[PDB]
Design a protein around this ligand. Structure first.
Ligand code: HEM
Ligand SMILES: *c1c(C)c(O)cc(C(C)C)c1O
Ligand SMILES: CC(C)C1=CC(=O)C(C)C=C1O
Ligand SMILES: CC(C)C1=CC(=O)C(C)C=C1O
Ligand SMILES: CC(C)C1=CC(=O)[C@H](C)C=C1O
Length: 137
């Protein structure tokens, strides 16, 4: 279920973070508008870039904490507030987050693995709801 999937992802977090973030960037090419340093690079070149890995990992380190602190895939309002009020998220809207979670769920469905993809889908919807509530447009 959801709590085991957090354990699974954390067990190889750099790998999973980069693979899911590349699945998001490739599924939604316009989303490389929030990322000028990634333009004109292949996946292998992005994995070579220290920024790419350090940053993607820090995104998933936080996402897994927000997942871990959730009850029944419902994130804490305090974690939504943190995500809306981060200076790095100033230009963002809930659609940015929705797309990341669609990619994440798709990746999980496509994997050979017993991820609880329905729970991730619901968590992403609940996060987007909480971000909206917290004041994201
Ligand atoms: C649950 C989902 C997400 C979490 C937990 C999260 C968390 C974070 C964290 C921790 C950072 C700082 C990393 C660093 O400076 O090394 C960051 C930066 C960033 N995040 Fe988010 N984020 C999420 C979703 C997104 C989405 C959906 C977008 C855009 C589609 C986005 C765009 C950014 C940008 C543009 C930066 C800074 C630019 C850069 O230097 O790469 N994030 N995020
Ligand atoms: C997430 C979890 C962890 C849970 O127990 C239930 C749901 C759905 C089935 C309401 C989640 O998305
Ligand atoms: C990043 C942005 C300029 C952009 C938008 C897109 O629609 C596509 C296919 C490709 C892109 O590069
Ligand atoms: C997801 C990944 C590439 C990522 C890395 C980052 O370092 C920042 C600042 C923001 C991100 O979204
Ligand atoms: C406890 C039970 C009803 C339940 C919990 C879940 O987490 C999932 C994905 C599916 C379920 O039906």
């Amino acid at each position: 279920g959801f709590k085991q999937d957090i354990a699974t992802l954390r067990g190889d977090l750099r790998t999973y973070a980069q693979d899911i973030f590349l699945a998001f960037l490739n599924k939604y090419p316009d989303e490389k508008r929030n990322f000028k340093n990634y333009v004109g690079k292949s996946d292998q070149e992005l994995k070579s870039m220290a920024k790419f890995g350090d940053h993607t990992e820090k995104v998933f380190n936080l996402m897994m904490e927000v997942a871990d602190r959730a009850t029944d895939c419902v994130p804490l309002a305090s974690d939504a507030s943190t995500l809306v009020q981060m200076k790095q998220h100033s230009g963002l809207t809930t659609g940015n987050f929705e797309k990341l979670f669609v990619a994440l769920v798709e990746y999980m469905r496509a994997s050979g693995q017993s991820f609880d993809s329905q729970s991730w889908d619901r968590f992403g919807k609940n996060l987007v709801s909480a971000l909206s509530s917290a004041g994201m447009k």
